[PDB]
Symmetry: D2
Subunit: 334 residues, 4 copies
């Protein structure tokens, strides 16, 4: 049984917990956040986006009790003061958003944790980044003790890029994500030290945003390094995002051939990772989807035999959370 | 001085905003409004605007007219444009903004009713109606022959000036556009039927909704040099007004974002003044509510992959900018 | 087995269909709407609010196939031309919004239907109105061939009123409902001859609206006839509403005592109709709730021993759709 | 000229600044917030709700330059270390939300300010609360050095209560406010130790909230103390709220008479505070209104001659900000 601790019981932390408490192979031993177990228990059972927790939730002054299983609840701002050694934590899910650099994420290993999974792109280039179904086989159990699971957008874009790249090559690519609002944005216009637009009211605006997903894809798919960039527009929805990839391929092809390969990948080497649809879907048709990427056949367009606009959905919350579990399960086995 | 007589068929978002923008012009004379509701509901919707605020002036009504700033305007309720009294009113231009008469057969009812010229506030349903975008191809207008015209779409009016600047300076090999578009009256609040686009029937408050757009092809019409070289799509999002275009374009000559921004800023200060705007500020959509521009180039949001591959971003108030272009086109046609 | 046809496959019609199609005692034989089976099947499969249909959906040019069941699909503007006599319809669910008067509803009877259930308050004083768990025992099989299941708000308010009246009496009561947006509202400012406010954009505004639910409960609970009125505020939410009842009681009492009686009723009589909670719930905690009314203890306030403000939630879509089934089932058995 | 500093350049602080920088009798000398002048210049210039600043906005490392006027920008978390004596600050607008107690607000006076106006209800009983046009005349310049301007909801409800009470008395009143989302709420579900609902996603939910605004009216209008209580529902709108008041009056009356008195007040002794409308209004019809309260005659309902439901709108951002300025101008005269 693999022992897991969660640092940051937020949107991602609670969703990895919800997805993982079902697995007998996993054991969640601790949750760390800046609030009491009462509020953690409330946020676990009630979810404005993914519905009520399908199970029993209780709490003590010192723990949550989920389906009878006891999980320790601690509240320490500094990860170094966490009891990871006493709980002998194998994996710590770093999902606070505040320790995406190595010096901060190294604090969990100092506390006694064996492996640290950062649920976000790393700020340092020396932390390996993995996307399940793209480059997770490059993981080194003997050396990679702090890893990154990339971004929700990277996890959506990289599988699409991989199928296109494998079959027709990519000369150039520009991506746009139309992304759901997240917790980093305020409800009304407010301060924002390093991105002024990011402080504008998320309920009111379409908001241009930077994304690192494109080059992060360059990390996971080196063959596309230097050939893709991207940006983002935050829109006033609470969850589910979509990627629009304009691609110039090397070989001539058509949308029918691309769709054939996407469908094949979704049924084969990327089943459970890449999804495929021909239906007239809109974003809420993917609420609580566990897939990283859902290729939208009807929304795609072809300018000509080498220029395409490919569209893929993702639940930026639920899909990433399940990938976080998938990566841990992989690391534990291999 | 001399006055152009205008009637509005369809007193909706575009119709009321065309009225708001044009009633300030002393050379224009709005002589009639046609819609399916009595002047009482029309006065109410004219007075109060959830997006552009209260009407800055006095609005009253009778059973047969609105009274705006002392001026009386005839208010009729006739579904059939053919039964409208355009001949009696000596209507020079009819703004067809109901959304139901974008083909020649439907718009021709206004000419049969007596109007001299008809401006469709939308893309024509068929290529047999000429389309004009101010500052791009409105000089190709023929006063003696083009009696039914189209002012294209908001997206076309935003995309085309960008395309024009890029093409004239570096050429275009390919261009793929996406518009992130505000919600409009064609979408319901909750999931409902929609025969012509199933996605079009899903709830607008809840979803990102992929949609089809003809704006790319329409620009190919207004700019023949670019025909076949541009396509596009749309995503409707839960905002009530203001949209943004994201154009992925491959140029012929090598260039850079600095050079492109230089030409965009030059165009906005020169030949496309009042049509194309230019900004370097960290703007978001609500910063353009009630903007009169067709297209506002957003230098900070643009990205360059390489010397020939760029992602250009341009905003537009799909209600207010288009309504101001409808008036400009009518003014242009009047002068010649 | 009871044979049911649905006129108007909209929000209410589709949800009634979702809740009932698993029922072996019910047989849905026909669906009538203004579109062909492909759009109806699409709308049955994907719901922006209640998620994907948990089952299989197929279609023909003339029929739907749900979980193997074949349902005829028609498109007739005039109910009088519907094949109810030929299909032997026991109950017709009138959920178009256009035939809530007796002359309009009677067209289903002339076409061959035996019973018509209007999914809204009737425009006619001689059409009986029932709220399950409040006054449905007054249904007379021999005379009530066209009945009304009231409004979603009436089904929420009446259970609250029933308990308070039965235990402490009601001298006066004023109701306010904060109501989710519905299909009658536009996305942007537009015309609306019978209620100008109703035409204003639902995404942007709090919109005052009139409601008849207050007098309608006077119909179902005659003891309160003439003693309560109400109003409504439409807000930019796609589903779930809340009732805020300001009530002057006859006998002295306390919030503790009221909550205790609400809790008893939720666990015994009115079980499945009235729900009870002491948690810090918000509207999305009730998406796809099947209850008519959920009493919110913590949201309630007491001015004094005879003046209370009681709060109760309801999924105006799902709860009402389930009560339409319950009403049909009650009528069917006797 | 009155020398004013703003502590907390947020929604209220910036909107107070916009309305007041136009006033030649006022002199804004300093702004304190936790961000650099660039971000403050940005937020002053562009407003998602009230549009672009109608004027010129410039900034340096150490100041804002608004319409030619130079204003100091400081970034100090502890108000005791603020440069109020050097700047000779007459009034400090406390709009951070973190110093609504006397121990906290008094730090501005310890720092050199003469008066402190809190843009929110005070925590302490000994800090007087004023509503313009209701009880502001009770201000005592010799002793009231820290005052509260109450809440946006109290400023909307109290004028309504005053006219009803003066004409027909109040036996009971229960108020509900349908309130716009504010900076206190997250976009998505998150923690909130003292009120769990307050942490739920504001874009997707109707959110019940506690309010003291009814009880505050009991303080500003002592005759109604113990007779009025209330609650709140936060809804997914960015601005403008509405109060809904269920009132049992003492004297028999009618909606027609109440409306007449409301219209009389809006035109007379509460012009600029109380507004009156008979139109079919909705929330966005009041964006950027400077009124505290707008009586909505058509939305009102009468159960009988003594039981009414009265409805009044308010721009919780813009109306309150103007009340803060009005209070400062009153205290300075
Ligand atoms: N939201 C998404 O869709 C998404 C997708 C992929 C990855 N991510 C990444 O996951 C990370 C978390 O995102 P989220 O949306 O769950 O955010 P969130 O704000 O919902 O959760 C973060 C949580 O961390 C807790 N926390 C903060 N500081 C802490 C500390 N010092 N110690 C312990 N707990 C602390 C907070 O109370 C909060 O609940 C971010 O870095 C984000 O970029 C988010
Ligand atoms: N909304 C935008 O941003 C935008 C911008 C550019 C172009 N347009 C075009 O303008 C047209 C109208 O757009 P809108 O947003 O104003 O729509 P809208 O829903 O506001 O409708 C326009 C008006 O037409 C009236 N109408 C309907 N049938 C009529 C009839 N038979 N006779 C007279 N009036 C009738 C309606 O009552 C309505 O008020 C569409 O063709 C649209 O494509 C819209
Ligand atoms: N949505 C709610 O919260 C709610 C709650 C309780 C009851 N209701 C009542 O139920 C009724 C339906 O409301 P809704 O929200 O489902 O509306 P809706 O607009 O979602 O669905 C109504 C359907 O009627 C169909 N229709 C229209 N004309 C028709 C005709 N002539 N013949 C056949 N079908 C026709 C339409 O295509 C449409 O799908 C209303 O009367 C409403 O007041 C609504
Ligand atoms: N927004 C409304 O509708 C409204 C109406 C009436 C009253 N109020 C009250 O006014 C106050 C401000 O609310 P708001 O909506 O403007 O909030 P906001 O979050 O928009 O602004 C608060 C500001 O305080 C500043 N701040 C935080 N800590 C600080 C510190 N230590 N020193 C200096 N500045 C600091 C922050 O950067 C932030 O800009 C609150 O007390 C609120 O309850 C708000």
């Amino acid at each position: 049984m693999t022992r897991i601790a969660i640092n940051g019981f937020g949107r991602i932390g609670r969703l990895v917990f919800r997805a993982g408490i079902k697995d007998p192979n996993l054991e969640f031993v601790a949750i760390n956040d800046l609030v009491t177990p009462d509020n953690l228990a409330y946020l676990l059972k009630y979810d404005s986006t993914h519905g009520r927790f399908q199970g029993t939730v209780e709490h003590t002054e010192k723990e949550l009790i989920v389906d009878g299983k006891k999980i320790l609840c601690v509240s320490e701002r500094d990860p170094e003061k966490l009891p990871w050694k006493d709980l002998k934590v194998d994996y710590v899910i770093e999902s606070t958003g505040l320790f995406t650099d190595r010096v901060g994420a190294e604090k969990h290993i100092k506390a006694g944790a064996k492996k640290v999974v950062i649920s976000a792109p790393a700020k340092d280039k020396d932390i390996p980044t993995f996307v399940m179904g793209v480059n997770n086989e490059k993981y080194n159990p003997s050396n990679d003790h702090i890893v990154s699971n990339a971004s929700c957008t990277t996890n959506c874009l990289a599988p699409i890029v991989k199928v296109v790249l494998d079959n027709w090559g990519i000369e150039e690519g520009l991506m746009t994500t139309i992304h759901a609002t997240t917790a980093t944005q305020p409800t009304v216009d407010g301060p924002s030290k390093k991105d002024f637009r990011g402080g504008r009211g998320a309920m009111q605006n379409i908001i241009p945003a930077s994304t690192g997903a494109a080059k992060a894809v360059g990390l996971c798919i080196p063959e596309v390094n230097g050939k893709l960039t991207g940006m983002s527009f935050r829109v006033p929805t609470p969850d589910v995002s979509v990627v629009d990839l304009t691609v110039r391929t090397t070989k001539e092809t058509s949308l029918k051939e691309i769709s054939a390969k996407m469908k094949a990948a979704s049924e084969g080497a990327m089943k459970g990772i890449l999804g495929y649809t021909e239906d007239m879907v809109v974003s809420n048709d993917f609420v609580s989807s566990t897939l990283s990427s859902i290729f939208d056949m009807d929304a795609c367009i072809e300018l000509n035999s080498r220029f395409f606009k490919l569209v893929s959905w993702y639940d930026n919350e639920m899909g990433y959370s399940n990938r976080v579990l998938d990566l841990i399960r992989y690391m534990a086995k291999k």
